[PDB]
Structure formats: C-alpha cells, structure tokens
Structure 1
Amino acid sequence: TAEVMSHVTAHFGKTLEECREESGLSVDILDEFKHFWSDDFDVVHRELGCAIICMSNKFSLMDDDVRMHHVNMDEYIKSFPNGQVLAEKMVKLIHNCEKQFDTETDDCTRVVKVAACFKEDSRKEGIAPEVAMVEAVIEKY
C-alpha cells in the first residue's frame, strides 16, 4: 500500500547524502529523497540512477548484474510495519519495469528509467505515497 511505501521510502532515503558524491547527484537535482514522489518531480537524470544503485547497495537490494535482488528486496520490505501486504506486488511491479529496459546496458541509465516506470506504475496500482506521508514517518524521530 501507499502507507507501507511511505515507511520504505522514508528509511531507504536516509542513504542519499552518503551516496551523493560518487553519483554526481547535485542538490539542485534532488535535495531530499522524499521528493522522488512529488507529482511534478521528473525521474530522469542518470545521476539519480547512480545514486539509487548506491543506496540499494547499502541494503543488498541489487543482484550481481545490478538488477533487483528479489529475495533481499522482499526481506527488506517485510522489515517494515505491514510490509507483507506490499512485498509481492512491489517486486512484481519493479521486475516488470526492468524487463522493459533490459536493452539499456548502462546501469545508472537503466536504473533511472526503471525508477520512472516504477513511479508511474506505483501510481496506477495504488502504492505511491504522497510526500506528506513520507514526511510523517520521518517526523516521528
């Protein structure tokens, strides 16, 4: 659900700043990872794709070929409250996007294209949070 995705996003986003330099991702492109979900944030920059690799690697969410590791992704998602309701759908949805971009061999570019597809399909399927839901989780600390 969108509520569960808010919790996943809020945690996943904590590795933005440590990944910023190696990805070449300007603050001007993305200042806080929660804005990934803004209606009018365009998910396009190769640097954001590099950042997403870097952030995923932190939680072993990538397989040897820089695609989603399905098992580790499922385990990550179920580590959040009610995570089991989202885990099957989210893997299926991401993997479907990956197949559409399998002919992009540049890893950063492939991953940003996959991220954009995942955002769009997440809205269609009802698992996209609003920024305010993401902020509400972050704000409990």
Structure 2
Amino acid sequence: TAEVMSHVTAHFGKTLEECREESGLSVDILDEFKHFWSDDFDVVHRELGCAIICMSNKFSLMDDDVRMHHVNMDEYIKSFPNGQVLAEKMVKLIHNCEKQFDTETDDCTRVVKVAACFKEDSRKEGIAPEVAMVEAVIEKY
C-alpha cells in the first residue's frame, strides 16, 4: 500500500547521499530520493541505476547477479509497519519488471529501466505514494 511504500522509500533514501560520488548522481539530477515518485521526475539516468545498485547493496537487497534478492527484499519490506500487505506484491512487481529487461547487458542501465517499470506498475496498481507522504515519514528511524 502507498503508506508502506512511503516508509520503504523514506528509509532506503537515507543512503542516497553516501552513494552520489561513486554513481555520478548530481544533486541536479536528483536532490532528495523522495522525488523519485514525483509526476515530474523521469526515471531514466544511468547514474540513477548505478546509485540504486550502491544503495541496495548497503541493505543486501541485491544478489550477486545485480538483481533483487527476493528473501532480503521480503524481510526488508516486512520490517515496516503493515509491511506484510506489500511484501509479496512488491517482490512480484519488481521481479516482473526485471524479466522485461533481462537482455540489457549494462547493469546500471538495466536497473534504472527496472526502476522506471516499477514506478509505472506501482502507479498502475495504486500503491505509488505521493512525495508529500514520503516527506511526512522522513524523520523515522
């Protein structure tokens, strides 16, 4: 649901600053990770894909194939309030998006394409949070 997705994003997003230098992700491409969800942010830069790899690996959310680690992702989503309602759904959406981009050989590019797909499918499924909802939870933890 959109509130669980707001907690997930608020917490995950706290690793963006430490990942900027190695990914090339300028503040002028993305200032705060919560903007990922804005109507006006296009999820397209290779550098954002490199950043997401950096951020994921902090939490062991990717496996050694630079794809989502399903078990660690399920445990991560369950770590938030009401996480059990989102965990299986989110893992399903991300992995369906992964399958569409398997043929992309550049890991950074692949990951940003998966991320755009995930944003799209989350919006479609009604679980995409608004930027304001993410901001409302930024203080936590």
**How much does 1:127 deviate?**
1.1
**How much does 1:140 deviate?**
5.5
**How much does 1:23 deviate?**
0.2
SS in 2 for 1:138: coil
Distance, in Å, in 2 between the alignment partners of 1:56 and 1:10 is: 14
Distance, in Å, in 2 between the alignment partners of 1:36 and 1:73 is: 19
Question: How many residues in Structure 1 have an aligned counterpart in Structure 2?
Answer: 141
Q: For residues 7-59 of structure 1, what are the alpha-carbon distances to aligned partners after superposition, in whole Å with 9 as ceiling and x for unaligned?
A: 00000000000000000111100000000000110000000000000000000
**How much does 1:126 deviate?**
1.1
**How much does 1:5 deviate?**
0.2
Matches within 5 A, 1:22-61: 22-61=22-61
Question: Which residue in the other structure is 1:106 paired with?
Answer: 106
Change (3 A) 1:133 1:106: same
Q: For residues 57-103 of structure 1, what are the alpha-carbon distances to aligned partners after superposition, in whole Å with 9 as ceiling and x for unaligned?
A: 00000011000000000000000000000000000000000000000
Q: For residues 85-128 of structure 1, what are the alpha-carbon distances to aligned partners after superposition, in whole Å with 9 as ceiling and x for unaligned?
A: 00000000000000000000110000000000000000000110
SS in 2 for 1:18: helix
* Gap runs ≥5 in structure 1: none
SS in 2 for 1:57: helix
Distance, in Å, in 2 between the alignment partners of 1:71 and 1:96 is: 16
* Gap runs ≥5 in structure 2: none
**CA-based RMSD:** 0.9
SS in 1 for 2:97: helix
Distance, in Å, in 1 between the alignment partners of 2:126 and 2:90 is: 11
**How much does 1:139 deviate?**
4.2
Quick one: percent identity of the two aligned structures? 100
